[PDB]
């Protein structure tokens, strides 16, 4: 409604770095807000794509951003009659970023790992890894919970059970208020997908450079399964947290699995012990239901509501014809111990191949009416197909069915404007929460400042 579309701020990164692929707000110890931006194709030391992270200070005029430096050198450790190896080439550092407290977590989902033992190996595979930083103090740490030292032969003998060699840990990431890092690894357990959790504090205090394989006792990974309904489901393709069980001492996880059950797709709500509380099945095969998930209370009843994107949903049109436009589903949380019923609202895209629902951002309460609102991305929508972000306002009954505002991409075709969104944070300290929109195709970020309502 009241996002200022006339005077935007632009941050830009190196060409071909995919600057803006992921982003988040970041408050230092003093509460000063900055933007953290992932650029998963930034060049490394050997002029080879390794990805990179940038920490952009708030400036009304934007501009260039300083790097958040991480170690990009491959590592080798000859220990226990074995050889441990990390490969950061094309690792995609910054494919996701999330900020909690004064810490920044930037993940490299396709960082590769291997173990050699004489003439045998574990296999060079993308276990992924996360780089944690405390910018002010300069502290650095890592977390790579899918790394292992089991040889290839052993997996074969065990029928490839508990195989975490292709986790791609950090594909998606979230941090609970308590400070527990939760990493989605859609390739885990031979492409079933797994979640990995561990306290940020414990990740830091147990990490030391050079070790490569260390224990984080307090960590907690989800489980493997023999059920084919989970095969190639990419469980952990997207993740979020929230309160869905009443008990405020417990935090519940929300996991998207867009290819679950033979591409029907699903999203599940779980407890911290990975026990399923609810499951929401997709409406249409290959719609990629679960591609994105958002958690926010939109009807001001204090109960967190769930939003699920299905960017490839095909709408039914005249003469028995389907048009791929994308769809978003709203599930309102019922009073007390009860199951989430049918979706309360279906938002469908308009532009063909627009991919409406690829990203969904809670905005907080944008117009200050007492209800939280959201933004939905259609990275290839708009009449021009250059991309579009649509704002939907909350209300007592859920959400408005029509958008209160439409942000058209200021960038050229192919910028993927909206592929990443983040809101609910007042960056200029003007009393209204603001929106930051990534456009990795154009290697830029746009900041939309919310202003007092005009009407």
């Amino acid at each position, epitope marked *: 409604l009241n996002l200022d579309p006339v005077q935007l701020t632009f941050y830009a990164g190196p060409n071909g770095s995919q600057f803006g692929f992921s982003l988040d707000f970041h408050k230092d110890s003093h509460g000063r807000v900055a933007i953290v931006v992932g650029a998963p194709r930034t060049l490394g030391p050997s002029q080879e794509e390794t990805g990179g992270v940038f920490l952009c200070p708030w400036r009304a005029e934007g501009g260039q951003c300083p790097s958040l430096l991480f170690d990009l050198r491959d590592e080798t450790r*000859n220990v226990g009659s074995q050889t441990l190896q990390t490969f950061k080439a094309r690792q995609g550092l910054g494919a996701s970023v999330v900020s909690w407290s004064d810490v920044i977590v930037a993940c490299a989902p396709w960082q590769h790992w291997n173990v050699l033992e004489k003439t045998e190996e574990a296999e060079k595979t993308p276990v992924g890894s996360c780089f944690l930083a405390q910018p002010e103090s300069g502290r650095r740490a890592e977390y790579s919970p899918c790394r292992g030292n089991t040889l290839s032969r052993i997996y074969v003998e065990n029928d490839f059970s508990w195989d975490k060699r292709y986790c791609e840990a950090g594909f998606s990431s979230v941090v609970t208020q308590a400070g527990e890092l939760v990493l989605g690894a859609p390739g885990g357990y031979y492409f079933l997908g797994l979640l990995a959790q561990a306290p940020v504090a414990d990740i830091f205090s147990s*990490y030391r450079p050079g070790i490569l394989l260390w*224990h984080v*006792s307090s960590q907690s990974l989800s489980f493997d399964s023999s059920n084919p309904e989970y095969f190639d489901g990419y469980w952990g393709y997207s993740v979020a947290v929230g309160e869905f069980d009443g008990d405020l001492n417990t935090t519940e996880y929300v996991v998207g699995a867009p290819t679950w059950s033979w591409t029907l797709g699903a999203v599940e709500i779980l407890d911290s012990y990975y026990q399923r509380l609810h499951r929401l099945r997709g409406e249409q095969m290959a719609s990629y239901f679960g591609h994105s998930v958002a958690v926010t209370d939109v009807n001001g009843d204090g109960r967190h509501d769930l939003l699920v994107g299905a960017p490839l949903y095909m709408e039914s049109r005249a003469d028995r014809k389907l048009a791929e436009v994308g769809r978003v589903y709203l599930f309102l949380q019922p009073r007390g111990p009860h199951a989430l019923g049918a979706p309360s609202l279906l938002l469908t895209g308009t532009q063909l191949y627009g991919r409406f629902g690829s990203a969904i951002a809670p905005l907080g309460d944008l117009d200050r009416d007492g209800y939280n609102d959201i933004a939905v991305a259609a990275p290839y929508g708009g009449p021009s197909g250059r991309g579009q972000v649509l704002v939907f306002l909350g209300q007592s009954e859920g959400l408005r069915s029509r958008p209160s505002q439409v942000l058209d991409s200021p960038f050229p075709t192919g910028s993927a404007f909206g592929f990443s969104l983040r809101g609910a944070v007042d960056i200029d300290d003007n009393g209204y929460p603001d929106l930051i929109v990534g456009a990795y195709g154009a290697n830029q970020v746009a900041v939309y400042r919310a202003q007092p309502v005009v009407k």
Partner: antibody
Amino acid sequence: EVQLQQSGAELVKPGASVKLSCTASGFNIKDTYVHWVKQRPEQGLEWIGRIDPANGYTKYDPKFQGKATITADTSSNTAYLQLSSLTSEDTAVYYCVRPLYDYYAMDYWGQGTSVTVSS
Amino acid sequence: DILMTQSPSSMSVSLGDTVSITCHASQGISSNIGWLQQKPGKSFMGLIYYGTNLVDGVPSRFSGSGSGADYSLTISSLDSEDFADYYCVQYAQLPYTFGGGTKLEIKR
């Protein structure tokens, strides 16, 4: 707090078999590797072997192959070390060990189990 | 097997001294070494791991160093408790191997 409660002192005769235990307290035995170490006054410290209680796979120093047998029961959260065909040279204090962070380290030790072989 | 020549076998020193034990390997072990302490009539306690890293709860007066096949545990300002047996251990290769040991005795 991590603690390894090893079984009490053992006093057996030559040729017999003994089985030592190492119960984990404050953590799951399945968490990390579990090594066994033999100690004698003159000879010093000798690494016997290790076990991964999760899957049961073991490794031994070829000096102890046949003599020592390391097992683990995740149920009782305990790791064991069995010594067969005992002799005088088997008279030593035995320790169970596990790493702190580093997968391959030797940081936490049990109080130790004294074994004496005599007729 | 990798041999660990740990010297000296013993040394007589007083409180507040700064002493350094050394450890030589029969080959390179790239910092894959650990240092242990055994107070008289008691079990073992981890001091250092992977060359230089202090085990949780260990006084900072302890410190590990060195590379290749030579390493050193150093104790700055000796304390009354520090008078005990110290061993080094390599886990660069299986089987793991220990040093001869070093007893810190009081001088007079």
